[PDB]
């Protein structure tokens, strides 16, 4: 019914689209490939900073972290500007959410500590939320590179939407920490052509994007209707049929999102 447009959209872009909007009191859950595994790509950075916040007192945001140019291995628009000074955990969080900074995410994982540079603690962190499905296995940028069907570094639209749900609308974080996670997503700079572009402007949209190879383009978001009702939208997509080199298509995420808005209005 709405499945007919999502599959319609998949045909248009030669894509696989996963969509999840958790049910509220007034609205029914929206499921499209909701429980199929998609790659996190950079979408993991939002629950990752929640992993850091949850584990640490606010005072920890001021911990200065140093690193070398050798640590800068992926898209890091902020971390490159700070090889000489380093960054505090807080700005690493800021960098990780608002600019999808990959090196900043890697150091936050290292701050999570432990095996695989913190990927097991981060997976462990998702389990604490009730997400038994997801796993992060590599750091940036290898986690964007797993071949299709490989279960490493994947989540599901269902799984991630519910994780975000407790992070932003629930009680996964104390209120003062919840406020920090929400504002970074709210002033994120990377999702203007994705979920945000499909909803009317008078809807509020906070989001964290993800992009990888095989045409992988994700956006996880929390949106508020003009009346102020919150919904969570998971939109995930890849274009594996085109190989490692498949171009990501943002139009797919904006088009799909509009469909969601049409049903949520
Ligand atoms: C909500 O995001 N919208 C954006 C966008 O990408 N802008 C970014 C955002 O939020 N930015 C911020 C900052 O971090 O505050 C800034 C400041 S960044 C900065 N601050 C310092 O104090 C410093 O010492 N050095 N630097 C580099 C300007 S735009 C960028 C945008 C860009 S053009 C346009 N019309 N919108």
How would you describe what is shown here?
It is classed as hydrolase. Keywords: Beta-Lactamase, hydrolase. It forms a monomeric assembly. The entry is titled "Beta-lactamase, mixed with Ceftriaxone, 30ms time point, Shards crystal form". The protein: Beta-lactamase. With 265 residues, this protein is an alpha+beta fold. It has a single domain, classed as Beta-lactamase, CATH 3.40.710. Helices cover 36% and strands 17% of the residues. The protein contains 9 helices and 9 strands. The chain has helices spanning 3-13, 45-55, 89-98, 102-112, 119-128, 157-168, 175-186, 195-198, 250-264, and strands at residues 16-21, 30-32, 38-39, 64-65, 87-88, 154-155, 204-212, 216-224, 230-238. The strands form 3 sheets. It has a 5-stranded antiparallel sheet, sandwiched between helices. It has a two-stranded antiparallel sheet with strand order 3-6. A two-stranded antiparallel sheet has the order 4-5. Strand 7 (204-212) and strand 8 form a beta hairpin. Helix 1 packs antiparallel against helix 9 (250-264). The relative contact order is 0.19. Bound molecules: Ceftriaxone. Ceftriaxone (9F2) is lined by residues 187, 189.
